[PDB]
Amino acid sequence: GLIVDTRDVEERVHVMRKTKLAPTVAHGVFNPEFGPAALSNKDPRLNEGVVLDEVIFSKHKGDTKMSAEDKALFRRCAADYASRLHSVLGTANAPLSIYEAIKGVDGLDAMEPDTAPGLPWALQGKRRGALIDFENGTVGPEVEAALKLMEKREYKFACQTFLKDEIRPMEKVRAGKTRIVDVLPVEHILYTRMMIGRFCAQMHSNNGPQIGSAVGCNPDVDWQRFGTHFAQYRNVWDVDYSAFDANHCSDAMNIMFEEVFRTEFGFHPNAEWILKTLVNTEHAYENKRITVEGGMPSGCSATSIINTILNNIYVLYALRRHYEGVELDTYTMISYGDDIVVASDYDLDFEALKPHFKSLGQTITPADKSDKGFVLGHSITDVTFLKRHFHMDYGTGFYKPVMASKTLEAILSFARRGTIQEKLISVAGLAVHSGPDEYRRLFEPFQGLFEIPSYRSLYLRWVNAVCGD
Amino acid sequence: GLIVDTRDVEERVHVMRKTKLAPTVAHGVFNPEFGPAALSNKDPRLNEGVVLDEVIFSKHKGDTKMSAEDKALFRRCAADYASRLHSVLGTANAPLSIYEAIKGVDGLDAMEPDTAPGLPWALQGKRRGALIDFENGTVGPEVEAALKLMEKREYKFACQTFLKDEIRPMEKVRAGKTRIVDVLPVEHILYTRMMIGRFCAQMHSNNGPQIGSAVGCNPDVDWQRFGTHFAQYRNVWDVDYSAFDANHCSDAMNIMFEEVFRTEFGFHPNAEWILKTLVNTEHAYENKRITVEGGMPSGCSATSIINTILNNIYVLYALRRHYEGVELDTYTMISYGDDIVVASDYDLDFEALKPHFKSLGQTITPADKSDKGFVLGHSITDVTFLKRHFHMDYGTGFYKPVMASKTLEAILSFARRGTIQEKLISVAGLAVHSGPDEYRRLFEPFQGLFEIPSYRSLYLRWVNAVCGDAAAAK
Amino acid sequence: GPLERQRPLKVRAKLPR
């Protein structure tokens, strides 16, 4: 997006911030090229000339203007994807009640009772519990008043910007490339769930290549489904974007909202409106108020679903901008936000699509960095999706999600204080798919300090999960 | 052209039915897949179903009537080419005297004293020498009477059809693809030379890509000039036409004559008229008189020059019919009748020009049989022009004209009785460019039977000719 | 340079195999 204004404000947000992540005994064995993101400008790991509070917003380099011809093409691509999407999901998209939106429904989890409430509540020392009764699914007068302003389309808000406390490549750490999450006001999340909650539930329930979305998938059980599908195609591509969320242009976002969330598909007319409030946003970071035009705020309600929808439309747009006679049957894809696998029996020239994605303000490169160029004849057993390869399990004849050993080593090398035993059991569920030898090697550092599940026990648990599905 | 009438008449115009081209000592060594064209319908080498008398006229498949749009485009292309031509040559296009037309001038060879006189003289048993004094450059009363009728635009004539006695690929011989020479009356040739002889002389003297004509070139010296020019362009194309001369439509011939040979460019008014006599022609073959509309008669005074001019206009027309903003500087070309090399720094789509040439009644194909479709990225060293490749000589860095060894074998394998010594010295001048090993192999059958010029003598003669032309330019 | 007379304003490639 374009940063159109930056100004200093007295009602500041946070205090001095330290990572909750600490190294484990694995760090000294694996020596990963990863570390906790810098959460302070005074972090001594930061390179000379790094201003953390600037670098975190440096992805906002402008709002790409699309030509009239490109806007018209994008609207047809948005309409064509929307047609497929609502054909699969149906048009049961009526608004949820306040109760249903707080409590969730089949395919949509309940709202979090004690996560950040956003602004201005955070500055008033209010938690979510002071504004909403999560047990009874009711709202106090503050949220009720805000909901009435949204009904009238008069609601205005700021996004509360937090640094992401997480493991990053050391190159990114030293450059001050700490990722951020935007906390929108709890009432904005509430109303968004009211407007598109049934839709999001249907997206989760129907995840797969037919709607081009993996949002709500379970990799353990769904890799068999996804792997079987993509194995049928001559060519498979995994595509990398640079700052996907930030570089969604206003033109693209507005057209996508207009075509996907139409009243004729069963949406309340304010579904389009509440989504369009994401285009021009104010971001509160410490004492800074930053106004941005374009880009998706990272961590608003339905971020994953919105980014996934745009990813689907971008591929149809880019192929149709380059090639004659492209339809939804020309290729298949699945996306989770910026993450994407595309496949076709056609020898599609993905290298030639680079300038077409650039018309959208998006920069694509191969996910496989062993070359800066796209090639033909890659298979499902070559690509990475959600940091997982597709490997055929010898024992079952089912695809399993296999993470790179370098990824698992980095994950095992850090943990929030007092969480190591819990984390090891969680990571064991990821590592089992690497096979018994690599599983044994990855957990060797922890033997005698923590209970490590046997490879055998997690393998049999997995077999039951995939045979059960 | 279109055959609009075929009738029988009393007086038979006889045709030579026996070849004069006998096998040489070389024939038994090379066993060439070439032989003399069939001159008789009874030739036993002809394939089953071949009627020689029919096949030789089968090139006459019609006279394309061009659209209003296309005639307007063609006229502006002919005018643009004429502007270029007359800008390079000047407009001193005054008629040659009778004397000049017979004896020739700088850039125009004398008329041949003892070639066929054409009709009606052939039927009267009269030779050229009985009608014209070639030594003193004067005409007898018969020719002077005909020249008076041409001045008054009342002259009428018939073309005499000769079968061409020549070596052809055996595939073409067996198919009955014997070529025709149209012999025009000697007085018609004389008056054409009077009307446009100066212009033809200027074309010969100024041959090159600037006027798009190689007519009157000397391949030994001019391959260096032509090669160096075409070497500078990204794309080069050699184009093959099907029966080029026969497929010139009346509309294209008439419009070209009107735009090139104008009085405002210094031509006598009868320059346009005498050329327009070539459009609607009567052809005498045995007892047959065949009336044809359209097509250039094959072997008139200025056939090569007329064909070359049309070839230049056809390329401008085709490119302008397909593309916006095409001008004479968009491409470069040189032509010798139907033979053509085109080049451009632009990726011109010659495959796409096929239907545009068809609108003129002309069928173009690649001269190369690696593909039936035209492609980009060919160079001057890939093309054939006047049956010669452009090869860089190792000794000099000069382009030399190299003929196919199989063709040189074929030329050496046949000769008219008593002409072998003369022919060997002639062909030696062609074969030197194949290099010393191939030169030796080609003449080895004749060793100890005839004088064979030393490779070295002909190589040094050639180097001196190209160097002399360069030393002159400096 | 020279541009085609009959080309549309959609200079898009054919799908390969």
Author numbering:
A (entry chain B): 1 to 469
B (entry chain A): 1 to 474
C (entry chain C): 5 to 21
The authors write:
The core enzyme in the replication machinery is the viral RNA-dependent RNA polymerase (RdRP) 3Dpol. The enzyme adopts the canonical closed right-hand polymerase fold, consisting of fingers, palm, and thumb subdomains that encircles seven conserved structural motifs (A to G), playing critical roles in rNTP substrate recognition, template/primer binding and catalysis. 3Dpol uses 3B as a primer protein to initiate the replication process. Unlike other picornaviruses, the animal pathogen foot-and-mouth disease virus (FMDV), encodes three non-identical copies of the 3B (3B1, 3B2, and 3B3) that could be specialized in different functions within the replication complex.
The best diffracting crystals were those of the 3DpolHis-3B1 complex grown in the presence of UTP and Mn2+. These crystals, orthorhombic P212121, contained two 3Dpol molecules in the asymmetric unit and diffracted at 1.7 Å resolution. The quality of the electron density for the 3B1 molecule in the P212121 crystals allowed to interpret with confidence the 3B1 amino acids from G5 to R21. In the structure of the 3DpolHis-3B1 complex, 3B1 molecule binds the bottom of the palms of two confronted 3Dpol molecules (named 3DpolI and 3DpolII), in an almost equivalent way. The 3B1 binding region in both molecules consists in a hydrophobic cavity formed by residues: from H322 to V326, T330 and from Y346 to L348. These cavities are occupied by two hydrophobic residues (G5 and P6; region I) and (L19 and P20, region II) located at the N- and C-terminus of 3B1, respectively. In region I these interactions involve the main and side chains of the 3B1 residue R9 and the main chain oxygens of residues R320 and E324 in 3DpolI. In region II, an equivalent interaction is established between the 3Dpol II main chain residues H322 and E324 and the main and side chains of R16 in 3B1. Region II also shows an additional polar contact involving the side chain of residue R21 in 3B1 and the main chain carboxyl oxygen of D345 in 3Dpol, slightly increasing the interaction surface (508.2Å) at this binding site. Furthermore, the two 3Dpol molecules linked by 3B1, interact with each other through contacts mediated by residues from G125 to P141 in the fingers sub-domain, forming long fibers along a diagonal in the ab plane in the crystal packing.
